[PDB]
Amino acid sequence: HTAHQATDFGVKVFQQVVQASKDRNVVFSPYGVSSVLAMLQMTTAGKTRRQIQDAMGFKVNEKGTAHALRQLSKELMGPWNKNEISTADAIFVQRDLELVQGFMPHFFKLFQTMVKQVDFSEVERARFIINDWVERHTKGMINDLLAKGAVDELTRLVLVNALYFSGQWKTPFLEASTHQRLVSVPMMAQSNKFNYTEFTTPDGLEYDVVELPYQGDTLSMFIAAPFEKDVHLSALTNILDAELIRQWKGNMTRLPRLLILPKFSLETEVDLRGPLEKLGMPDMFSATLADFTSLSDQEQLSVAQALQKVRIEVNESGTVASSSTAFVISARMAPTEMVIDRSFLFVVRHNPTETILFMGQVMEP
Structure with a gap:
């Protein structure tokens, strides 16, 4: 159930990315976006969380949904697939941001990743730490995910999936x-x-x-x-x-x-803020509307943008x-499309779970 909902959501996001991309070649990872958005549920509350839950079709904190997603990553990574898949999720938070009591233990329980602290005001160091984590988790395939200006002194939270x-x-x-x-x-x-x-x-x-x-x-x-x-x-x-x-x-x-x-x-990098807003989750991007009080109630927090870079x-x-999906600012500039005789859609699918790891379109020029 959860696996199937995760797929339908990521495909809806794909459709929004394709729509905004206007006939450019696009490669995209539905599983990557659903993984990070699942984490985002646990950092948000109020209408922000509700927007995400409504759009995704499930509530990470309910029933055995978080457990289902952890078992999904296990199944995707299993040796019987006969092809290497790795997926890793991370959350980087401002070091001196006071977290809600019990957040770190609860997040680790649901997601089996520990909150990583980072001083985003050390802008180059913060970028390195996150870019290095992404490289290490995409076998060096996704480089410099965070360009200059991707995060800054005001950044408080970055969530990232890396898929290989x-x-x-x-x-x-x-x-x-x-x-x-x-x-x-x-x-x-x-x-x-x-x-x-x-x-x-x-x-x-x-x-x-x-x-x-x-x-x-x-x-x-x-x-x-x-x-x-x-x-x-x-x-x-x-x-x-x-x-x-x-x-x-x-x-x-x-x-x-x-x-x-x-x-x-x-190799493409797409904005996800537009697609996510269009799919009914605009609040998280607003410094005035966003509710991240599941993460911290010390401070008003929001995320500026989200992107995903895929090769x-x-x-x-x-x-x-490989893909990495991250809530950071994109300084992406359009690449030189490639040449093809005919347009086609491709879908890389783990069939037992219906999980779509990557899908894309190659468009005839």
Whole structure:
């Protein structure tokens, strides 16, 4: 239940990111955002907390919800997945901020991470400590998450998730079969039995979905694209949810397909404040409206922004992807989009839990 709600929420956030991104390539981690927002529930109260709970569909402090999320991270990280996944969450708080009595023990209980103290007025040191934690937890893949100005003397709380995935295709592509397509673009190619389905959107737009599994039996990448190349991908991203993805998988049959997939690396950083506000959680970003009295009642607190930086590398042997989601200010500037013959949506999914570790869109220019 909790796992499924976490997914639906992160997909809604993805949809908001895609909407605000206006046809740029986007890679994004639903699990990453849900992990950090789950922590945020425990730092907030009043209407701030209620906004998050309402949007997420669950209350971290209730029933065995926090326990469910800890068991979810365990399952994702288990050796039987046959592909490395690590997820880590951290909370950095202003060192001299007086915390609510019992906060640190309770947070550790629910989340199994201890509050880390940091003096944000030592701006460069604070940035280092947090950036270093992110690097250490993404195997050095997510660098300098916090740019200059990401935090400052007024910062009181930063929550961060770091997620790392390295998967090997169940059947790799042969480098020999990779060819440049004409800017020159490397296209990988493999003919094998793949789970495949055709599908149509509510408006009768046709599209299909193929599943490229990673080794083992839990992880795969879904690739979805309209049959007609001219169709704007919003036709698909507008209708995405966990149910639709279950419907894809549930509908597939295994068949000998020629699979063409671009060899590509994508690295994006997206604002999450807009998406979170649009999804009904504006209060946390307001120094006057925010309620962080679950964390501290010494002081009015808020978070200025949130962002997530994600990198994915897809090649002949598999996929390496990393994200870090953090409540810090983004000094992101747009990157140079890459070239592709056709738009498609990809979803990296832990199928047993329906958890989406990464999803994204590659948009034809």
